[PDB]
Amino acid sequence: MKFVSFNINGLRARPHQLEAIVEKHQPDVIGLQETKVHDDMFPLEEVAKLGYNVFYHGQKGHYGVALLTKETPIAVRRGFPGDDEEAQRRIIMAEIPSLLGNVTVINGYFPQGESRDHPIKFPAKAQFYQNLQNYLETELKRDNPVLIMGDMNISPTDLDIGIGEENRKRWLRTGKCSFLPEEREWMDRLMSWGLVDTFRHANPQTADRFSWFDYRSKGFDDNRGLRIDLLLASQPLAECCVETGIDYEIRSMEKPSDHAPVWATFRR
């Protein structure tokens, strides 16, 4: 079962990248973030033509998530139970069937946060992680197959930072979000529940693979980016991970999203 996560940054502006992912990877499940399209305008026929079932929610020009699956899910919903409207445009959760059990899949577009001192965006980010943590602890078990994917907007370790030492320190000094100590705390708490960062686990010493590169600075050319798009899997799933990757080739396409698609393949 292959999973691909991709912050497309405008689904209707980049049908070419979505088709490329399907052709190249033939994935069983695709989680999209920042689709930026209103539900009434979602490319339902186009997605159906690609051979996928799809569940989605977003609003015009902002947020938006979609979960494309080859097989039909047992259950799917937007947001965690009790979540507000905004959270519903940032999270899709599903139970995907397999012969001997179900896999819980969570696709999220986590708040960027902007800066530690932003009176609205930073609390929103903290609360988003708190809601996820609480869902995990109250409804799931570390022994269940769970896969959390998406744009986390947090670089878990320093091996995930490629913008340069001086820039790294300036960001910390000014409180710019991505790798603040508070943010790392939320991420560590999440991992401690019993999740494995698939790419990092398969590539324990790689310090030159990133998933996001800033447009304006032309970061992709110099490989100056951050690895903030992750695929976190619980124990029983992590044990079966045979391949992981970040697709630089797709990020090399014309009119590309600033994010590279990331993937993980599970096979026993």
Swiss-Prot record:
The active site is at residues 109, 151. Its cofactor is Mg(2+); Mn(2+). Probably binds two magnesium or manganese ions per subunit. GO terms for molecular function: DNA binding; double-stranded DNA 3'-5' DNA exonuclease activity; endonuclease activity; exonuclease activity; metal ion binding. Mg(2+) 1 binds at residues 34, 258. Its EC number is 3.1.11.2. It comes from the Bacteria. Mg(2+) 2 binds at residues 151, 153. The keyword Nuclease applies. SUPFAM superfamilies: DNase I-like. GO terms for cellular component: cytosol. The record marks 153 as: Transition state stabilizer. It catalyses: Exonucleolytic cleavage in the 3'- to 5'-direction to yield nucleoside 5'-phosphates. PANTHER family: EXODEOXYRIBONUCLEASE III. NCBIfam families: exoDNase_III, PRK11756.1, xth. Monomer. Belongs to the DNA repair enzymes AP/ExoA family. This is Exodeoxyribonuclease III. The gene is xthA.
